[PDB]
Amino acid sequence: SYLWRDSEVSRSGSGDEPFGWVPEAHSVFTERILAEEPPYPCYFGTQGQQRGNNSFSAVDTRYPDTHGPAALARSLRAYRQRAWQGPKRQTLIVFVGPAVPGAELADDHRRFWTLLDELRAYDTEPWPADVPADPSDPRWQWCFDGEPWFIFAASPAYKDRRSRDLGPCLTLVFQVRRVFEGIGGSTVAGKAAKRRVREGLARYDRIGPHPTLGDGTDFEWRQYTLPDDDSVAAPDACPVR
Numbered sequence: 284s285y286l287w288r289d290s291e292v293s294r295s296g297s298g299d300e301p302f303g304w305v306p307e308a309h310s311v312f313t314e315r316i317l318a319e320e321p322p323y324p325c326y327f328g329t330q331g332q333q334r335g336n337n338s339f340s341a342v343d344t345r346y347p348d349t350h351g352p353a354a355l356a357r358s359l360r361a362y363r364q365r366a367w368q369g370p371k372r373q374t375l376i377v378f379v380g381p382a383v384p385g386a387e388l389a390d391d392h393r394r395f396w397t398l399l400d401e402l403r404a405y406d407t408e409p410w411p412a413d414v415p416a417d418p419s420d421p422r423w424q425w426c427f428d429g430e431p432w433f434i435f436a437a438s439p440a441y442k443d444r445r446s447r448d449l450g451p452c453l454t455l456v457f458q459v460r461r462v463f464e465g466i467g468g469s470t471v472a473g474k475a476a477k478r479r480v481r482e483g484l485a486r487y488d489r490i491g492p493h494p495t496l497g498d499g500t501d502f503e504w505r506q507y508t509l510p511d512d513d514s515v516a517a518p519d520a521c522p523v524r
Protein backbone atom coordinates (compact mmCIF):
# COMPACT_ATOMS: atom_id res chain seq x y z
CA SER A 284 0.00 0.00 0.00
CA TYR A 285 3.09 2.20 -0.12
CA LEU A 286 3.43 1.91 -3.92
CA TRP A 287 2.57 5.31 -5.43
CA ARG A 288 2.16 6.86 -8.84
CA ASP A 289 3.09 10.55 -9.08
CA SER A 290 -0.44 11.71 -8.28
CA GLU A 291 -0.55 9.50 -5.17
CA VAL A 292 2.72 10.53 -3.52
CA SER A 293 1.24 13.60 -1.80
CA ARG A 294 -0.93 11.26 0.31
CA SER A 295 2.13 9.42 1.65
CA GLY A 296 2.35 11.72 4.69
CA SER A 297 1.96 15.34 5.77
CA GLY A 298 4.22 17.04 8.31
CA ASP A 299 6.14 15.01 10.90
CA GLU A 300 4.04 11.85 10.36
CA PRO A 301 5.75 8.78 8.86
CA PHE A 302 6.72 9.65 5.29
CA GLY A 303 5.92 13.35 5.90
CA TRP A 304 9.26 14.14 4.21
CA VAL A 305 8.42 12.08 1.08
CA PRO A 306 6.43 14.69 -0.92
CA GLU A 307 9.35 17.12 -0.87
CA ALA A 308 11.81 14.36 -1.80
CA HIS A 309 9.52 13.49 -4.71
CA SER A 310 9.50 17.10 -5.91
CA VAL A 311 13.29 17.39 -5.63
CA PHE A 312 13.65 14.17 -7.64
CA THR A 313 11.28 15.25 -10.42
CA GLU A 314 12.96 18.66 -10.66
CA ARG A 315 16.32 16.93 -11.12
CA ILE A 316 15.09 14.49 -13.78
CA LEU A 317 13.01 17.06 -15.70
CA ALA A 318 15.59 19.86 -15.61
CA GLU A 319 15.92 21.63 -18.94
CA GLU A 320 19.52 22.85 -19.04
CA PRO A 321 21.69 20.91 -18.88
CA PRO A 322 19.23 18.02 -19.22
CA TYR A 323 19.45 15.08 -16.89
CA PRO A 324 21.97 12.65 -18.52
CA CYS A 325 19.62 9.66 -18.64
CA TYR A 326 16.87 10.55 -21.13
CA PHE A 327 15.33 7.20 -20.40
CA GLY A 328 14.65 8.31 -16.83
CA THR A 329 13.39 11.70 -18.01
CA GLN A 330 11.10 10.10 -20.59
CA GLY A 331 9.87 7.59 -18.01
CA GLN A 332 8.96 10.48 -15.71
CA GLN A 333 7.21 12.46 -18.47
CA ARG A 334 5.25 9.38 -19.56
CA GLY A 335 3.94 8.47 -16.11
CA ASN A 336 6.04 5.30 -16.02
CA ASN A 337 7.84 5.97 -12.73
CA SER A 338 6.42 4.60 -9.49
CA PHE A 339 7.53 5.48 -5.98
CA SER A 340 7.88 4.08 -2.49
CA ALA A 341 9.77 4.94 0.67
CA VAL A 342 11.39 3.66 3.85
CA ASP A 343 11.07 5.70 7.04
CA THR A 344 14.03 4.75 9.21
CA ARG A 345 12.23 5.91 12.36
CA TYR A 346 9.56 3.19 12.04
CA PRO A 347 11.21 0.05 10.65
CA ASP A 348 8.45 -2.30 11.84
CA THR A 349 5.70 -0.56 9.83
CA HIS A 350 7.48 1.65 7.25
CA GLY A 351 10.59 -0.41 6.69
CA PRO A 352 11.85 -3.47 4.85
CA ALA A 353 8.77 -5.65 5.42
CA ALA A 354 6.52 -3.02 3.84
CA LEU A 355 9.06 -2.40 1.07
CA ALA A 356 9.01 -6.10 0.20
CA ARG A 357 5.25 -5.81 -0.24
CA SER A 358 5.68 -2.66 -2.34
CA LEU A 359 8.33 -4.39 -4.48
CA ARG A 360 6.08 -7.39 -5.14
CA ALA A 361 3.31 -5.01 -6.21
CA TYR A 362 5.74 -3.03 -8.34
CA ARG A 363 7.07 -6.18 -10.02
CA GLN A 364 3.55 -7.05 -11.18
CA ARG A 365 3.08 -3.48 -12.42
CA ALA A 366 6.45 -3.52 -14.20
CA TRP A 367 5.39 -6.45 -16.38
CA GLN A 368 2.24 -4.72 -17.68
CA GLY A 369 2.06 -1.80 -20.08
CA PRO A 370 5.28 0.09 -20.81
CA LYS A 371 8.49 -1.89 -20.70
CA ARG A 372 10.45 1.15 -19.49
CA GLN A 373 9.21 1.62 -15.92
CA THR A 374 11.25 2.40 -12.80
CA LEU A 375 10.59 2.26 -9.07
CA ILE A 376 12.20 5.05 -7.03
CA VAL A 377 12.40 4.44 -3.28
CA PHE A 378 13.32 7.29 -0.94
CA VAL A 379 14.99 6.32 2.36
CA GLY A 380 14.48 9.02 4.97
CA PRO A 381 14.29 11.27 6.83
CA ALA A 382 17.40 12.82 5.28
CA VAL A 383 20.59 12.70 7.35
CA PRO A 384 22.55 15.99 7.09
CA GLY A 385 26.22 15.48 6.29
CA ALA A 386 26.14 11.74 5.61
CA GLU A 387 29.18 10.39 3.76
CA LEU A 388 28.80 8.41 0.54
CA ALA A 389 30.30 5.32 2.19
CA ASP A 390 27.59 5.54 4.87
CA ASP A 391 24.77 5.75 2.34
CA HIS A 392 26.23 2.79 0.44
CA ARG A 393 26.40 0.79 3.67
CA ARG A 394 22.74 1.64 4.30
CA PHE A 395 21.91 0.53 0.74
CA TRP A 396 23.47 -2.91 1.11
CA THR A 397 21.93 -3.38 4.55
CA LEU A 398 18.48 -2.63 3.14
CA LEU A 399 18.93 -5.15 0.32
CA ASP A 400 19.99 -7.72 2.93
CA GLU A 401 16.89 -7.01 5.02
CA LEU A 402 14.69 -7.46 1.93
CA ARG A 403 16.03 -10.96 1.23
CA ALA A 404 14.44 -12.07 4.50
CA TYR A 405 11.00 -10.98 3.23
CA ASP A 406 11.25 -12.56 -0.23
CA THR A 407 8.47 -15.13 -0.66
CA GLU A 408 9.94 -16.67 -3.83
CA PRO A 409 13.05 -18.85 -4.23
CA TRP A 410 16.15 -17.41 -5.81
CA PRO A 411 16.01 -17.72 -9.63
CA ALA A 412 17.64 -20.80 -11.10
CA ASP A 413 19.28 -18.89 -13.96
CA VAL A 414 21.21 -16.56 -11.61
CA PRO A 415 24.10 -17.69 -9.35
CA ALA A 416 23.28 -17.16 -5.70
CA ASP A 417 26.92 -16.52 -4.73
CA PRO A 418 27.61 -12.74 -4.80
CA SER A 419 31.24 -13.41 -5.73
CA ASP A 420 30.16 -15.14 -8.94
CA PRO A 421 30.81 -12.97 -12.03
CA ARG A 422 27.19 -13.55 -13.09
CA TRP A 423 25.51 -12.60 -9.81
CA GLN A 424 22.71 -10.07 -9.99
CA TRP A 425 20.43 -9.05 -7.15
CA CYS A 426 17.20 -11.03 -7.23
CA PHE A 427 13.85 -10.67 -5.52
CA ASP A 428 10.38 -12.14 -6.02
CA GLY A 429 11.60 -14.66 -8.56
CA GLU A 430 13.69 -12.60 -10.97
CA PRO A 431 16.86 -10.46 -11.21
CA TRP A 432 16.71 -6.69 -11.10
CA PHE A 433 18.95 -3.79 -11.88
CA ILE A 434 19.25 -1.65 -8.77
CA PHE A 435 21.38 1.36 -7.99
CA ALA A 436 21.96 3.81 -5.14
CA ALA A 437 21.65 7.58 -5.41
CA SER A 438 22.82 9.91 -2.65
CA PRO A 439 23.38 13.62 -2.01
CA ALA A 440 26.99 12.66 -1.22
CA TYR A 441 27.67 12.19 -4.96
CA LYS A 442 29.45 15.50 -5.45
CA ASP A 443 31.33 14.81 -8.69
CA ARG A 444 29.01 12.13 -10.13
CA ARG A 445 26.12 14.57 -9.83
CA SER A 446 23.91 12.38 -12.02
CA ARG A 447 23.54 10.14 -8.94
CA ASP A 448 22.54 12.99 -6.60
CA LEU A 449 18.75 12.74 -6.81
CA GLY A 450 18.02 14.80 -3.71
CA PRO A 451 18.59 14.83 0.02
CA CYS A 452 17.86 11.15 0.71
CA LEU A 453 19.56 7.90 -0.07
CA THR A 454 17.40 6.79 -2.99
CA LEU A 455 17.13 3.29 -4.42
CA VAL A 456 16.29 2.89 -8.10
CA PHE A 457 14.80 -0.51 -9.02
CA GLN A 458 14.12 -1.93 -12.49
CA VAL A 459 13.19 -5.37 -13.74
CA ARG A 460 15.37 -6.59 -16.60
CA ARG A 461 12.53 -5.96 -19.10
CA VAL A 462 13.55 -2.29 -19.25
CA PHE A 463 16.66 -3.16 -21.27
CA GLU A 464 14.97 -5.31 -23.89
CA GLY A 465 15.85 -3.77 -27.23
CA ILE A 466 18.99 -1.97 -26.03
CA GLY A 467 21.31 -4.87 -25.27
CA GLY A 468 25.02 -4.17 -25.49
CA SER A 469 25.51 -5.91 -28.83
CA THR A 470 22.61 -4.06 -30.44
CA VAL A 471 22.76 -0.97 -32.64
CA ALA A 472 20.18 0.69 -30.37
CA GLY A 473 22.10 -0.21 -27.21
CA LYS A 474 25.34 1.31 -28.46
CA ALA A 475 23.44 4.46 -29.47
CA ALA A 476 21.81 4.61 -26.02
CA LYS A 477 25.15 4.47 -24.22
CA ARG A 478 26.58 7.15 -26.54
CA ARG A 479 23.64 9.44 -25.81
CA VAL A 480 23.68 8.97 -22.04
CA ARG A 481 27.46 9.33 -21.88
CA GLU A 482 27.32 12.54 -23.93
CA GLY A 483 24.83 13.74 -21.33
CA LEU A 484 27.17 12.77 -18.49
CA ALA A 485 29.93 14.83 -20.20
CA ARG A 486 27.70 17.93 -19.88
CA TYR A 487 26.47 17.24 -16.34
CA ASP A 488 29.01 15.43 -14.16
CA ARG A 489 32.41 16.54 -12.84
CA ILE A 490 33.84 13.06 -13.51
CA GLY A 491 33.40 10.86 -16.55
CA PRO A 492 31.64 7.53 -16.90
CA HIS A 493 32.85 5.04 -14.31
CA PRO A 494 35.03 2.22 -15.67
CA THR A 495 32.70 -0.45 -14.28
CA LEU A 496 29.98 0.73 -16.69
CA GLY A 497 32.14 -0.78 -19.45
CA ASP A 498 33.47 0.41 -22.80
CA GLY A 499 29.96 0.95 -24.25
CA THR A 500 29.07 -7.46 -17.72
CA ASP A 501 30.75 -9.56 -15.04
CA PHE A 502 30.38 -8.24 -11.50
CA GLU A 503 27.39 -6.01 -12.16
CA TRP A 504 27.15 -5.38 -8.41
CA ARG A 505 29.87 -2.74 -8.72
CA GLN A 506 27.50 -0.64 -10.82
CA TYR A 507 24.91 -0.61 -8.02
CA THR A 508 27.16 1.57 -5.82
CA LEU A 509 29.51 3.55 -8.06
CA PRO A 510 32.12 5.56 -6.15
CA ASP A 511 32.39 9.32 -6.65
CA ASP A 512 35.86 8.88 -8.21
CA ASP A 513 37.69 6.43 -10.48
CA SER A 514 38.32 3.82 -7.78
CA VAL A 515 37.42 0.25 -8.74
CA ALA A 516 36.23 -2.19 -6.10
CA ALA A 517 37.58 -5.72 -5.80
CA PRO A 518 35.28 -7.98 -7.91
CA ASP A 519 34.73 -10.60 -5.21
CA ALA A 520 34.03 -7.98 -2.50
CA CYS A 521 30.29 -7.44 -2.90
CA PRO A 522 28.98 -6.52 0.60
CA VAL A 523 25.75 -8.55 0.27
CA ARG A 524 25.13 -11.59 2.48
Ligand code: HEM
Pocket residue numbers: 316324325327328329331337372373374376435446447456462463466476477478480481496497499506509
Ligand atom coordinates in the same frame (compact mmCIF):
# COMPACT_ATOMS: atom_id res chain seq x y z
C1 HEM B 1 14.14 7.38 -12.84
C2 HEM B 1 14.70 6.54 -13.70
C3 HEM B 1 16.15 6.51 -14.05
C4 HEM B 1 17.24 7.11 -13.49
C5 HEM B 1 17.26 7.96 -12.24
C6 HEM B 1 18.37 6.77 -14.29
C7 HEM B 1 19.68 7.19 -14.02
C8 HEM B 1 20.79 6.88 -14.78
C9 HEM B 1 22.12 7.28 -14.50
C10 HEM B 1 22.56 8.10 -13.30
C11 HEM B 1 22.92 6.78 -15.48
C12 HEM B 1 24.42 6.95 -15.61
C13 HEM B 1 25.20 5.69 -15.22
C14 HEM B 1 24.99 5.33 -13.77
O1 HEM B 1 25.17 6.14 -12.88
O2 HEM B 1 24.66 4.22 -13.44
C15 HEM B 1 22.07 6.09 -16.39
C16 HEM B 1 22.51 5.44 -17.51
C17 HEM B 1 21.68 4.62 -18.27
N1 HEM B 1 20.37 4.40 -18.11
FE1 HEM B 1 19.21 5.25 -16.83
N2 HEM B 1 17.97 6.01 -15.31
C18 HEM B 1 16.65 5.81 -15.25
C19 HEM B 1 15.83 5.06 -16.09
C20 HEM B 1 16.26 4.27 -17.13
C21 HEM B 1 15.48 3.38 -17.87
C22 HEM B 1 14.00 3.13 -17.71
C23 HEM B 1 16.30 2.76 -18.80
C24 HEM B 1 15.75 1.83 -19.80
C25 HEM B 1 16.31 1.57 -20.97
C26 HEM B 1 17.62 3.31 -18.61
C27 HEM B 1 18.76 2.99 -19.31
C28 HEM B 1 20.02 3.52 -19.06
C29 HEM B 1 21.18 3.15 -19.88
C30 HEM B 1 21.21 2.19 -21.05
C31 HEM B 1 22.22 3.82 -19.37
C32 HEM B 1 23.65 3.85 -19.90
C33 HEM B 1 24.65 2.92 -19.26
C34 HEM B 1 26.00 3.17 -19.91
O3 HEM B 1 26.28 4.20 -20.53
O4 HEM B 1 26.85 2.29 -19.81
N3 HEM B 1 17.55 4.21 -17.58
N4 HEM B 1 20.77 6.15 -15.94
Ligand SMILES: NC(=[NH2+])NCCC[C@H](N)C(=O)O
Pocket residue numbers: 433435463496500503506
Ligand atom coordinates in the same frame (compact mmCIF):
# COMPACT_ATOMS: atom_id res chain seq x y z
N1 LIG C 1 21.92 3.11 -14.59
C1 LIG C 1 22.48 2.25 -15.44
N2 LIG C 1 23.80 2.08 -15.42
N3 LIG C 1 21.71 1.60 -16.30
C2 LIG C 1 22.17 0.59 -17.25
C3 LIG C 1 22.09 -0.80 -16.64
C4 LIG C 1 22.37 -1.88 -17.68
C5 LIG C 1 22.64 -3.24 -17.07
N4 LIG C 1 23.99 -3.28 -16.50
C6 LIG C 1 22.47 -4.32 -18.13
O1 LIG C 1 23.38 -5.11 -18.35
O2 LIG C 1 21.44 -4.40 -18.81
